């Protein structure tokens, strides 16, 4: 549902991922082992936790990641939210593109929420109290 094929033949897959307020749209095509979020290479990403969070699915899928280009468009939600959204999109796109069940099994036993996303969003602030306090 979150992955839509675009062209086939030269197979292209557009995947979506969300976390809090971050939305990530990822395009995966059969290229080299490159991957770019917002036009920046993955191994030049300045925030280290966000970079590692984005690249965990690539680490889990060892040589399959070396056969597809991944271009990511991430918007909104803060740095960790964007990192998690991009990670979710990359994992879903990898599973959908390669049509692998062994990879999906690995992704779910690593982190079950990688392909399932995050339902919990936030909680509002009620009147008469300092914050939500729920």
């Amino acid at each position: 549902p979150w992955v839509s094929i675009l062209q086939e033949n030269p197979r292209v897959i557009i995947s979506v991922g969300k976390k809090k307020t971050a939305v990530a749209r990822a395009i995966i095509k059969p290229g080299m082992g490159r991957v770019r979020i917002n036009g920046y290479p993955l191994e030049l990403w300045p925030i280290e936790m966000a970079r590692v969070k984005m690249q965990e699915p690539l680490i889990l899928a060892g040589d399959l990641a070396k056969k597809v280009d991944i271009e990511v468009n991430v918007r909104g939600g803060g740095y960790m939210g964007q990192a998690i959204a991009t990670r979710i999109a990359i994992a879903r796109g990898l599973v959908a593109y390669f049509q692998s069940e062994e990879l999906k099994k690995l992704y779910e036993e690593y982190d079950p929420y990688m392909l399932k996303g995050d339902p919990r969003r936030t909680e509002p602030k009620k009147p008469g109290i300092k914050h939500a306090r729920s």
Partner: peptide, 12 residues
């Protein structure tokens, strides 16, 4: 020093 970045500048 970072051979991983070669794919972004000088692709094979």
């Amino acid at each position: 020093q970072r051979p991983e970045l070669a794919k972004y500048v000088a692709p094979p």
